[PDB]
RNA sequence: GCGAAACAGUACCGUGAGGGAAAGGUGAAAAGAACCCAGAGAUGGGAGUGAAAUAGAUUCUGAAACCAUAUGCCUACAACG
RNA sequence: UGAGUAACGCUUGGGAGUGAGAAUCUCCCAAACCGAUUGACUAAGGUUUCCUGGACCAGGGUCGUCCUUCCAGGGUUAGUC
């Protein structure tokens, strides 16, 4: 059946990337929390 | 359906009684000496006088 | 101009197939961020001979001792194609 | 002969270990036996 | 300066060997060792392993080499003195050089 | 005088292997070779070795007659397990056991070992109540 | 001969056995 | 005890925000077992080092549940918290 | 404990060879299914899973000398796509 999740390179960037959650306040509370945690992953942009 | 009460361990033993294996019946082929099991060809293809196969 | 763009020369089999028969064609690795013109340039500046064209590969970094307690990946590669004219083979080892 | 092993880091038994998260995310439905 | 340097002749005041007099071949600072001849003789059943042009012979046997001592457990030997024996050691400066110059406080022997 | 061999996280589960073992203990050493060399099991192409390593091991280490051994006790103790998930239905999880066996094969000359290691036993129990005795009457003497 | 005696496995970094250089067999393995 | 004594906000889960583990100790010193035997090998049994090898890398001590072996006693007309 | 129980998720026979060990690996001959497809080219996605040699700790619902698993080396060439 169609799952929910069908991968694309495009959409992924284009939603949860850096430059993408770098263009709201929200976006930039988030990022500061996560580096408060430390995350390795930042966002989905460092994928590798 | 599922066991309401836990078999103990001495159930468990009582049904394996059964479980014994049998040692199965061997001879000694009539060429070379080696215990082979019965009725059938021995390592060097030689059952009896004929010889079936070639040496191992 | 500074030629650190010439990291290391490497053979393989398909760099010694190509290396004969007339025109020689060496494969050295380059700096990642170089471009084909700045190829051409550091082999005239450091060798004295014009290519006669350059091919650019990019070699992907992928998960190397795969299992190992610590996993590490690779390291990004571009490899360039140098053939000189008709006749002529310098060596990559001796000035 | 020529068996030895002078590099850092050589093993044939590689150490690695099986885990297992536990998903179970087991769920229900309705019924016909329903006496009301 | 070191209370112990490499070369200068020690003894051992602790452990199975006593008296044992040598000198000392290399000094770890880091981990407070000392390396010293003909003591603490130690032979590793040295296997084979052939790798290498080297490796392709490595004869090795029951080789026996030297195994590192705590250097508290070194003493300082004393040569000058018609009866040598085992004391502790100052760092006098003398204004003749202005160098630290170790000396022997059971007696008045330089170095 | 035993001598015997040991093997560590043999793959065949200790319920398998005890119904090979039960087969060899009280035999004589040719009887118990052709009995293990020609029965259709899994736990039988690894005892032979086991066993055969103990013969050579007896006969050459220990110094025995080799004429006289017998198959003393082979056990297969519980061996570590390994822990595996397998992917049940509607998303649920089971987890596989792989069960492992240490496998030891022991063989004497002497046909009343057992004897000695009672023998043992009851000296230990000996010099527990010889050190009870000696203690008490230390305490009266006090 | 003696190239035919040192071009057996002894494989190269980059290369493989069988096809072992016929000139160039001194340079790593020396 | 900080989630984290180890390379932990890691492995892993989720599209995402987010959620989030377990895991330490050989020996004073590797002196980490040359060599022999069985085995294809791992490995095991000897040898050797070591005070100790039932301290051997599965590495301080090693409890119970659990699984097997055995000396002694009992048990195949028997209704059993 | 259930219990060595249910299950092991659509495909046969033989000859020769390797190997310590072969219904399962290699080659050959058949045999059986696909054939608007289990055939061939690519987009998306996957990210080395591709080729060679070696290995059989772990994974492969059995076995394994074999693997899309692991180790070492190598592999992607544009003025016109
Ligand atoms: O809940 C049920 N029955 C209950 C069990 O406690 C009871 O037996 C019952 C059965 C029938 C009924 N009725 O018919 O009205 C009412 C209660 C069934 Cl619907 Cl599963
Ligand atoms: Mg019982
Ligand atoms: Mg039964
Ligand atoms: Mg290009
Ligand atoms: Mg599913
Ligand atoms: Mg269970
Ligand atoms: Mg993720
Ligand atoms: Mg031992
Ligand atoms: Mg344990
Ligand atoms: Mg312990
Ligand atoms: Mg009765
Ligand atoms: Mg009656
Ligand atoms: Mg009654
Ligand atoms: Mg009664
Ligand atoms: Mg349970
Ligand atoms: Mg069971
Ligand atoms: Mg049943
Ligand atoms: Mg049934
Ligand atoms: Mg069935
Ligand atoms: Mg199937
Ligand atoms: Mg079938
Ligand atoms: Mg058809
Ligand atoms: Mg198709
Ligand atoms: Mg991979
Ligand atoms: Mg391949
Ligand atoms: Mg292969
Ligand atoms: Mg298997
Ligand atoms: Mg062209
Ligand atoms: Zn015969």
Redesign the pocket.
């Known amino acids: 059946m169609k799952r929910?999740?069908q991968?694309?390179?495009?959409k992924?960037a284009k939603?949860?990337g850096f430059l993408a959650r770098m263009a709201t306040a929200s976006g930039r509370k988030?990022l500061k929390?996560?580096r408060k945690?430390?995350?390795?992953?930042l966002?989905?942009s460092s994928e590798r | 359906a599922?066991?309401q009460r836990?078999?103990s361990?001495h159930?468990?033993?009582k049904?394996?009684s059964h479980?014994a294996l049998t040692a199965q019946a061997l001879s000694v082929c009539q060429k070379c000496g080696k215990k082979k099991l019965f009725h059938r060809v021995c390592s060097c293809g030689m059952y009896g006088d004929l010889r079936v196969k070639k040496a191992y | 101009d500074v030629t650190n763009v010439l990291l290391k020369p490497?053979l393989?089999?398909?760099?010694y197939f190509?290396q004969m028969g007339e025109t020689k064609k060496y494969?050295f690795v380059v700096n990642p961020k170089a471009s084909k013109t700045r190829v051409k340039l550091a082999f005239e500046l450091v060798y004295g001979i014009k290519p006669l064209?350059?091919?650019?590969?990019?070699?992907?970094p992928?998960?190397?001792?795969?299992?190992?307690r610590?996993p590490g990946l690779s390291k990004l590669e571009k490899?360039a194609?140098i053939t000189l004219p008709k006749g002529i083979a310098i060596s990559v080892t001796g000035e | 002969x020529x068996x030895x092993x002078x590099x850092x880091x050589x093993x044939x038994x590689x150490x690695x270990x099986x885990x297992x998260x536990x998903x179970x995310x087991x769920x229900x439905x309705x019924x016909x036996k329903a006496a009301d | 300066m070191q209370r112990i340097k490499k070369g200068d002749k020690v003894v051992v005041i602790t452990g199975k060997n006593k008296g044992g007099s040598g000198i000392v071949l290399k000094i770890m600072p880091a981990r407070q060792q000392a390396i010293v001849e003909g003591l603490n003789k130690?032979?590793?059943?040295?296997?084979?392993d052939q790798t290498t042009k080297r490796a392709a012979k490595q004869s090795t046997?029951k080789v026996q080499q030297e195994?590192?001592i705590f250097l508290s457990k070194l003493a300082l030997f004393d040569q000058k003195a018609k009866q040598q024996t085992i004391g502790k050691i100052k760092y006098v400066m003398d204004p003749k050089t202005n160098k630290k110059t170790r000396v022997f406080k059971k007696s008045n022997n330089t170095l | 005088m035993i001598?015997?061999?040991?093997?560590?996280?043999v793959?065949i589960?200790?319920?398998?292997a005890?119904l090979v073992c039960?087969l060899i203990?009280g035999k004589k050493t040719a009887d118990a070779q052709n009995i293990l060399s020609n029965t259709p099991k899994k736990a039988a192409?690894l005892i032979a070795?086991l066993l055969?390593?103990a013969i050579?091991?007896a006969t050459?280490?220990?110094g025995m007659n080799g004429d006289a051994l017998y198959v003393f006790?082979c056990?297969?103790?519980?061996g570590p397990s390994?822990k595996?998930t397998?992917?049940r239905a509607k998303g649920s999880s089971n987890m596989?056991t792989?069960?492992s066996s240490n496998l030891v094969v022991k063989l004497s000359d002497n046909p009343n070992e057992?004897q000695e290691?009672?023998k043992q036993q009851k000296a230990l129990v000996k010099k527990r109540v010889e050190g009870q005795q000696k203690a008490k009457m230390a305490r009266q003497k006090a | 001969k003696q190239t035919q005696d040192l071009t057996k496995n002894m494989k190269i970094?980059?290369?493989?056995k069988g096809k072992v250089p016929p000139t160039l067999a001194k340079d790593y393995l020396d």
């Open positions: 929910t999740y991968p694309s390179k495009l992924r939603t949860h988030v929390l996560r945690k430390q995350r390795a992953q966002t989905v | 599922v066991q836990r078999s361990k159930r468990r033993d049904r394996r479980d | 490497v393989t089999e398909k760099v190509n494969v064209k350059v091919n650019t590969l990019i070699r992907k992928t998960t190397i001792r795969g299992g190992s610590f490899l194609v | 130690v032979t590793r059943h040295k296997k084979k046997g195994a590192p | 001598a015997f061999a040991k093997q560590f996280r793959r589960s200790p319920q398998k005890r039960q203990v192409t070795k055969n390593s050579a091991n050459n280490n220990h006790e056990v297969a103790n519980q390994m595996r397998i992917p596989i792989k069960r057992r290691l009672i | 970094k980059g290369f493989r």
